[PDB]
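<given_protein>
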Amino acid sequence: KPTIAAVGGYAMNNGTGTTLYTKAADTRRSTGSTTKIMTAKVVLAQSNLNLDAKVTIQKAYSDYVVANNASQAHLIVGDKVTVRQLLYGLMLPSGCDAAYALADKYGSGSTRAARVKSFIGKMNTAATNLGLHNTHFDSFDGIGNGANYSTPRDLTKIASSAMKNSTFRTVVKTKAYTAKTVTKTGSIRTMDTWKNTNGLLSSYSGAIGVKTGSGPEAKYCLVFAATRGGKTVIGTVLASTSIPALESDATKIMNYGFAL
């Protein structure tokens, strides 16, 4: 069994569900921005989903990332961004501003506050429905406020579920995406390219994902997935030392799972 720096780790064969690696796999820990995996899953589950629908960027979303010192996609207030573009902004640079836009959009309620509350409720319901017992969300990005934890095992199940969606899969393996949005005056703005923070996409042969995570207590986390010769390994590493350490941990676990 490989030795990793992360305090928590887990991996399984995505196809069969067989656990391939474990390390404090069921110990609750802050998820940080990896929570966005659930945010995306909930959105993609909406029956009234229209990926081409345009959402106006509110000043609230920009103030939010500032007030919470959160990673952002640099969405400009007044811009009209499609739900699909928001999914890229959410998953590539870890846009907490995009997370707010999606929660506001897909939560139920007559006000923004009521809608974000409703959305977070859907995230918890989604976890429950997956049979999870060690996952809880009090925010839509894992950076908001309250209790936001999961476990390497729970998070891997969430990601596996999300990977069943073709849009999710596409977004998650994209290294770079340049959004062309509509400004408040009708012209089309070419935003600075969004680069995926997941270094494994270009450093690990066969890497398909999923997503990085960070936060004051979420330090450096990573939900990874790779496919090699018809076998897909998916897993999570929580609370690693550094970025390089994080990628090495994920690499070791995946290489181990592929050899078994």
In short: The first helix runs from residue 36 to 45.
